[PDB]
Design a protein around this ligand. Structure first.
Ligand code: HEM
Length: 77
């Protein structure tokens, strides 16, 4: 829970080109680089890392309990 990210900063961590795959959810920045469902920063052909995905989670076919297994590494501004 160390670092604070702006929108522009977070956008770098999209899981591609040697960058880790981060996203934001309700102010928290999660690291999902390790998830087999976030390979290359692409989630199910519909979502990409580097973004605040709070709104998009409303349509996900899961509750946000799937986030609990991944570390929060910071805060979105
Ligand atoms: C809207 C389209 C999306 C689809 C179709 C989708 C689909 C899925 C599916 C099918 C699973 C695993 C099966 C299950 O858990 O029921 C999953 C897991 C997961 N989803 Fe999504 N999701 C979407 C959006 C999102 C969003 C917006 C987030 C983050 C805010 C997210 C984060 C995760 C995470 C962290 C996991 C667990 C990954 C793992 O355990 O390795 N998903 N997603």
């Amino acid at each position: 829970a160390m670092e604070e990210f702006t929108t522009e900063e977070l956008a770098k961590y999209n899981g591609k080109d040697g960058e880790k795959c981060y996203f934001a959810y309700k102010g928290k920045v999660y690291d999902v680089t390790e998830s087999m469902l976030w390979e290359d920063g692409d989630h199910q052909g519909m979502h990409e890392g580097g973004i605040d995905l709070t709104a998009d989670h409303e349509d996900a076919p899961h509750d946000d309990d799937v986030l609990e297994d991944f570390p929060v590494v910071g805060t979105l501004k």
